[PDB]
């Protein structure tokens, strides 16, 4: 959904995060995704190097 483009989504908290994928790199806010997607029957788990 994010490969190429860059999308900005509000979280469960009131704040907002930009999610982007440039050159096969997917990053959410400050820290890059380290493991891509893990299906869990109500959405996805993405795994991240550091705490936002």
């Amino acid at each position: 959904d994010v490969v190429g483009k860059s999308v900005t989504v509000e979280t469960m908290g009131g704040d907002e995060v930009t999610i982007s994928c440039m050159k096969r790199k997917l990053v959410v806010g400050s820290s890059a995704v380290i493991r891509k997607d893990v299906s869990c029957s109500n959405g996805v788990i993405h795994v991240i190097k550091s705490v936002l």
């Binding site: 190429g4 860059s6 907002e16 930009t18 400050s30």
Partner: protein
């Protein structure tokens, strides 16, 4: 290097078809929000050296081991290259504010940086801390909420643009870590 215009064009070439209506509508919102972008970049062009000095001084004061011997801010020359690198990061973030797309920031500055700071022994978390201080300071100047500086502008909502600038700083921070 791609602006928002060339981003719409490249996406439409992936679609391999004419631009049409909707993409141009989003780009019309870019044009009508253009003067806010101009005044925002004006707010970051002017206060940058001070922001850079403050952010790196805050980086040293939060983490005093940099000024300690055998740290990467120890030698006077290393402090000079430190201040200059903060200035250059803020410079390409300002370019990403004019362009509206992060292709200038990704191609010119971001790509080749993590491996460089690793190859030099530069602590990366300290750099991301300095990028975070430039982020908060840049959003405070961009929202006219700085304490020592409150310049008059005609009022209006600009939260979109603040999220945009925070996205670029977030991007720079993400790249280092």
């Amino acid at each position: 290097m791609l602006d928002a215009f060339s981003r719409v064009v490249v996406n439409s070439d992936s679609k391999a078809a004419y631009v049409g209506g909707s993409d141009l509508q989003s780009l019309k919102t870019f044009i009508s929000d253009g003067n806010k972008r101009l005044d925002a970049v004006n707010c970051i062009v002017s206060n940058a050296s001070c922001i850079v000095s403050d952010a790196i001084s805050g980086m040293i004061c939060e983490n005093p081991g940099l000024i300690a011997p055998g740290g990467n801010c120890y030698t006077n020359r290393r402090m000079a290259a430190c201040l200059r690198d903060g200035e250059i990061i803020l410079r390409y973030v300002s370019y990403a504010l004019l362009a509206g797309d992060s292709s200038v920031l990704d191609d010119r500055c971001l790509n080749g940086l993590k491996e460089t700071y690793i190859a030099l022994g530069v602590p990366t978390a300290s750099t991301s801390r300095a990028v975070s201080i430039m982020k908060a300071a840049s959003t405070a100047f961009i929202m006219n909420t700085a304490s020592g500086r409150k310049i008059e502008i005609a009022a209006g909502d600009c939260q979109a643009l603040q999220s945009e600038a925070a996205a670029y700083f977030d991007k720079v921070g993400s790249a280092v870590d």
